[PDB]
Symmetry: D2
Subunit: 410 residues, 4 copies
Amino acid sequence: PSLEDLLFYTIAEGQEKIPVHKFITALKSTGLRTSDPRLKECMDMLRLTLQTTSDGVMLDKDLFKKCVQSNIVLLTQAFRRKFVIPDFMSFTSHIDELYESAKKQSGGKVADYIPQLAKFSPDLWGVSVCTADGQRHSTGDTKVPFCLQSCVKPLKYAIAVNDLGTEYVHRYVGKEPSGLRFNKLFLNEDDKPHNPMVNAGAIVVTSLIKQGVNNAEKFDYVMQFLNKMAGNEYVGFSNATFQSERESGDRNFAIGYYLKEKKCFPEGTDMVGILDFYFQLCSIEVTCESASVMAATLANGGFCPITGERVLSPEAVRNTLSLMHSCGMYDFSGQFAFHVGLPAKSGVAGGILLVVPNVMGMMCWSPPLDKMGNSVKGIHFCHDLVSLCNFHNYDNLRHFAKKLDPRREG
Amino acid sequence: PSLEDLLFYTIAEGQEKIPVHKFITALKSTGLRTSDPRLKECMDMLRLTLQTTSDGVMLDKDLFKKCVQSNIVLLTQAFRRKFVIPDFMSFTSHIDELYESAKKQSGGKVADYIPQLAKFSPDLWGVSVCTADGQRHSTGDTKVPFCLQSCVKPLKYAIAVNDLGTEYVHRYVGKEPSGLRFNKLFLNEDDKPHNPMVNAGAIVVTSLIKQGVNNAEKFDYVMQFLNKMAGNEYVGFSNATFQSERESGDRNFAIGYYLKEKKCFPEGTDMVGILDFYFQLCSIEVTCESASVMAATLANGGFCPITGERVLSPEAVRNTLSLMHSCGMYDFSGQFAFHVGLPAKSGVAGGILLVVPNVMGMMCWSPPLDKMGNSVKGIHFCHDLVSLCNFHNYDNLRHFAKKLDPRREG
Amino acid sequence: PSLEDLLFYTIAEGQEKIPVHKFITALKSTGLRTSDPRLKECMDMLRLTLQTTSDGVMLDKDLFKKCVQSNIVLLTQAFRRKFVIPDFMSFTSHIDELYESAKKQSGGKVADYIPQLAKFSPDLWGVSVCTADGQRHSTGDTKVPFCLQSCVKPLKYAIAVNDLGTEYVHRYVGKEPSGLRFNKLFLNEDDKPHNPMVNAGAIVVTSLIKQGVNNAEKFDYVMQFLNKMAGNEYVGFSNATFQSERESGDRNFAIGYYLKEKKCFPEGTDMVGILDFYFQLCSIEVTCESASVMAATLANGGFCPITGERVLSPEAVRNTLSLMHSCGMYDFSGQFAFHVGLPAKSGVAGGILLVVPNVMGMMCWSPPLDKMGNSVKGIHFCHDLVSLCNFHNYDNLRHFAKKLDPRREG
Amino acid sequence: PSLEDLLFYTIAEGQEKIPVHKFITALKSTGLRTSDPRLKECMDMLRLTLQTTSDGVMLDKDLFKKCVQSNIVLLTQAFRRKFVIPDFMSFTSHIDELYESAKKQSGGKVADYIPQLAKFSPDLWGVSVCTADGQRHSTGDTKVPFCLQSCVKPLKYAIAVNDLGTEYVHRYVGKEPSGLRFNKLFLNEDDKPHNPMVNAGAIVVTSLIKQGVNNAEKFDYVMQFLNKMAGNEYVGFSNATFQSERESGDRNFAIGYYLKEKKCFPEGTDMVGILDFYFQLCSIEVTCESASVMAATLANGGFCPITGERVLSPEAVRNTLSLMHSCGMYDFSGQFAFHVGLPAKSGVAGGILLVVPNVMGMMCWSPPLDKMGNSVKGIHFCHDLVSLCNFHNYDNLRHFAKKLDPRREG
Ligand SMILES: O=C(Cc1ccccc1)Nc1nnc(OC2CCN(c3nnc(NC(=O)Cc4ccccc4)s3)CC2)s1
Ligand SMILES: O=C(Cc1ccccc1)Nc1nnc(OC2CCN(c3nnc(NC(=O)Cc4ccccc4)s3)CC2)s1
């Protein structure tokens, strides 16, 4: 018979008509959101159907078939456990417990150099997960908005390489980490910044994106890009943080003039204008939830997991994850790579963009920072997750000891 | 039916009586070598049958099963295309092309600071592949013995961590890469060597291994350990190279006394003694083939692909792969990391020990080195390998553009 | 039998009277100039005397005594070879041979990074000598005005210490050379610039001068201070150099913002304003002749030698010569300290301000610079000087080999 | 009218016959020691006169002449205040206050890294002055022998340059201070040690002295050289310190091999042989008194003040004072040069070898060191000396404010 109601008998159990509330509760348990863009046709029909028959609320064979025929491919995969994490309900409990285990880590100091980011209660703590199949889960303050800050750095690097290619972008900027407390330097021996993840590298990267338009079009061009990446979830902009960031980044200006004087920018660059653009991209706002989609886009070869849409070339995404692995956690990058072994990127607002390649993207957020600039709970969470799961970049898929593999059965 | 005669019809192909050579031929085409340890009881039963009447030999449903009972599970996986690389025959055609491509790169200079090394013709070039399922292929001078040199460093880090655990080992040696030209500073800021892949670190690591027995026992122990990792293929020792490496190795003696004075060795370490242990270890010999198994052991979570034996703990194997990633190719390390994205370790003899986690282990060998001391042909091969396949640590398993995935058939 | 009358007979030689030209010749050969401020009385009398009856042109013992009356003590020392260099007419011969030898050094590039220094002919070459007694000498292009540039660094440092003292000034700036490729860094291990002789230090020093008045007042102040130091010989300003230096000084802005960021300036500093004042100070013009007097004030413990006025404290002068010793010649400081062993300071305009303590002060000017930014002719000249005379600051006064001592009789 | 005569009635009274005790007392007051080698023929005669004509002890016009005639030139200069410091008795008062003021400085830790220096009481404190004319003064523990250690470094460099010239020696060793903390590096950018005053430099310089002879003869040759510099005062040897310094000198062996590897030693250099020679030179013993005579030879252009014997070339003496100036007090070198401005060399035994060129030499001794490695009382004394006297390199001889100048009379 048909795909469309092989799947029916599947959910229908023994009876002949599936309640609407049952089917929905099934769908939700596969971790799909009833607001999933890929499921719009089917949810709209259901809603239309609840209207045109108060008479209900149960779906027979053909009623079910005229709702799910629209998105039958994605609905089949979800219901037959063909997603990257099959028992997703089990998984999210573990996530919750990791969350609670972290929440108890009261250490750290809120970034206060800008008045805006000391307006956030330290209590706040959120984690959001988006799988490469569009499975979602959150716990904590995942709907509070904050600035990306340095979390934006791999995102705009990715745009450059997507628009300009590996070879060109790296005429201007390095690809290695700089060395334990080989820190205070701006350029390396070839008079390029060390990599996209440091400020000096980021600033140069900013100067390549959409060259030859003004700092309003460049800004919108990038937001368009991020909007696609986040499946059109929340992507705002705090100007309060921008005016503060600019009237305060003396160090950044030092970096600007230093790069100028050493001719690090492309020909015909307006350096002070790049600095405003840079301060702007730092002020872009996300929620845990929206960011986790973005991260999942990196986790998913560049295709946005909840829309299907190709946002980034594989070349861009691969390049980006490579530098997040080595340069992503300020002076904690070497330790984080050893013990965690995941691409991550931290920002001074308490955010940590985290990617488990081929599995999921995440965003942890908690304002209080440790001595190295990283979110304390965020760090504790990340070490826990890889203690529990074989997610380390050099964990084994076949032999992994006491760990748990969310990619498998029971 | 049963697993065994079921497999009989698969090789049969309409026919009545499966010829022996037809079985061997079909066996080889899966990747497995006729001499695989796990196929002992099968091959024995075969050589036994090859004498009940030395004219044939035609296995019926019964004689076939008698010869394949013992190993039916492996034989079934092999023939049902269940191995990590299902179409191995195809795959080794690409390996062979990649080999001829790199064969045309005659640049570089054979090491010569030791007489034992400029004896090697600059045209020696071998590639050996061993997959996590035991599949073998060699093209080139893969049975010529050469010294491991710095290629041994990840193997004795492994051993140490396997015997002593992470926390004890990394009291004495760091775990990050060092810095720009850094081949220079012998210690990080905590007065440990930077990582176990540089000479200061290796030397410390040698001093943690099997403490409190003499150098003769210690060496037997590492040998025994390498024999497990190489599935009992060729592991030797080159006393010539050992002598030449010692009477002409003042830099290692320099580091030794520096380490001793800053108190980097365990209590009661006879430093000069340790150096000679280290010199012996650099002079261990392997072949492309044998070493590619060792490399496949790291690919396979610490279990030897061609015996089944647990050789190293997951902690050891993961730690080693993390540090090879970032520290494994001398100054070229960060560039390797970015472009090739695989754990590898190189050696002044022309060896590059390469690991494709969960897929395979490898060992390339061409004596002529580039200006950073890395085999020219080897480097070229590794670039092409990843240019062609989605083996790069941050390629996507699902969206990989115009790359080939040897793990898939469909 | 007293004072002014011995001086009459020693010149008249028992002749009738004294021819006025004979006296001015005798005077000029002591090294003193006719325009010497300490002689203005004597000279003025002499010209007006040759009017009461110009019918002369002689001098009665009567007539004479009343002219030399006022300056008798100085005119006596001069004529009784009491000055620091007795045989001055012989010394100026060696200076001349030294000028001609250095003149044959074709080499160097003129500073062609700013249109005001590209301006200058490479063939320009001038040397001026002022002893601590006001004995003068010039040869070459010594009345052409040029910008001090970095030659102003010791001067403005001196002023700062003169006004605020050693302790306060050295809260904001260190007192050592940097390291011979710590040339690059801006701050030492205590977040102060390494010393006042380097652009970071100079800028900070600039912020210490006449704090809390505006940049026109501060500038006027330094100008007048430099006027004292040069016995009111030419001190100018080049607005052209000023505009250029500020259109083109991206590195200096880099340094400014770095310092502001690290809180190196005194509280309440307008950093952008201190940069302009700094640019202004570099754009100060002098001639060979006026500058050699400033160098002479340093050689003379802080008294201007041609006027007698206490310009700088001994503390200020000591301090300054200490740092010119070790930090004065850019990357060539160590090689200069060893071989010439004299306090000197060079600038991009081609100048070298050279001090021989307790003896003389000099200024060398030749616009073509070497690869380290020092004047080619200047450097050569300084080496020859100390090859000839026991002026090396660790030469012996009592045992000095094949060298010559301009301070001794025969 | 003879010098012998004039001097007689000079010391007379206008009188008859000088008492012997009145002559000796008068002689001591010029600072000269009764055992001056240049005074020996005269002192024998006095002692001999007291014995013979015991019927005295009044020396008349011809008895006196019979004594002082042998050494009349020097005895004149002594009594006619011709010596470098004319009022020497006044000067010793000052030294004595300086000594007492430093004596109240109980800070410091005595070196403990070998048992030989652990032993030394913390309160030992001695100062000795020898002028370039042989005027001596001691106060405190100045006859106790202690080891030169790094205080030998300037001495053996002087010997190298004396025998081999500047050009040779400085192939092998640099001539600049390392960096305000490049100390840990052994080699500069040209693969030479930074300067003679650091261990790597000292060791290379050791390897240049008397090449091609065994250590017995080499060591003699240096000892014979040291005796000449000290006018034959105490130059001993500590075998105890030798043995300890070798069976514990691991950092030096580190330096030794590094140096061998990078090929800093002259061809045919037995590296370990050189090390032992090095350890021996560091164990050469001196007293404050004998060391002050050595320092005085350096202060005197290479002539030994109390023998008049030419010990070193002026090229050697100049070169050493140069490097003592900028590299002498380990890491405190920059600070010392700025504040004290005299050439000095400190050692871990607590000595400070001090030179006031054209004036005097000095050894201060006091075993407790500061965190920098310098004798605490030593350092204190050096600052106070230059507070009090215009001996700073860049103090002015004509304008020195409120300082005292010991080179002038009333
Ligand atoms: O460190 C300290 C105090 C300190 C000192 C000692 C110990 C611990 C702390 N202060 C400063 N720290 N960073 C500074 O950066 C400044 C701005 C950019 N700079 C540069 N950035 N990048 C370069 N690199 C090449 O110019 C090329 C190169 C050549 C050779 C090796 C590496 C790089 S310079 C140089 C100056 S100032
Ligand atoms: O406590 C620490 C570590 C540390 C790290 C960070 C901060 C604070 C402390 N100790 C040490 N760590 N490494 C050391 O090196 C040793 C000493 C000299 N060596 C030499 N290395 N390199 C040379 N020669 C050029 O490096 C040539 C050169 C090139 C460019 C510029 C200057 C010199 S000698 C090799 C051995 S000592």
